[PDB]
Amino acid sequence: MAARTDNSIVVNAPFELVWDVTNDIEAWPELFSEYAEAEILRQDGDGFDFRLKTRPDANGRVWEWVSHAVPDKGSRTVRAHRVETGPFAYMNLHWTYRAVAGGTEMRWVQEFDMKPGAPFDNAHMTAHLNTTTRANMERIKKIIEDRHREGQ
């Protein structure tokens, strides 16, 4: 009854680099094709809230919202969720990093449910997010590997 996406990818680089690149919020406009702006608004000890503003989407519509994140480097995981849910009833995010042979495996999990009346229903939104997440994970993969190559 609730929607969810679960995607993984291996980046041939150490944990430290993979972690610092992906958690660098102010760089998301460069890492993610959908974001035009991204800024940390404030810090609340363990965690912080940030604002995201998209580039025109497939229909030319620009979206903006505030989220709250709680990264935990010690446990190689990061949790986040929308504060201003937009068309979502709720939107949760869970990322994990695991050391594997050759690099680091990133696993991104999204848990959400559409508000009755939203332009998208669960099934269609799930497919959409799977598509966009896969493209972003592959993109970020190349970027991190370039940096790594440059550091060696």
Closest-CA residue to 142 (of 45, 9, 1): 9
Resolution in A: 2.2
**Technique used to solve these coordinates:** X-ray
According to CATH, the topology of domain 1-152 is Alpha-D-Glucose-1,6-Bisphosphate; Chain A, domain 4 (3.30.530)
Helix axes 122-151, 15-22, angle to 10 degrees: 120
Asked if 89 contacts 101 with a C-beta cutoff of 8 angstroms, the reply is no
Closest-CA residue to 138 (of 22, 10, 13): 10
CA 31 to chain centre: 10
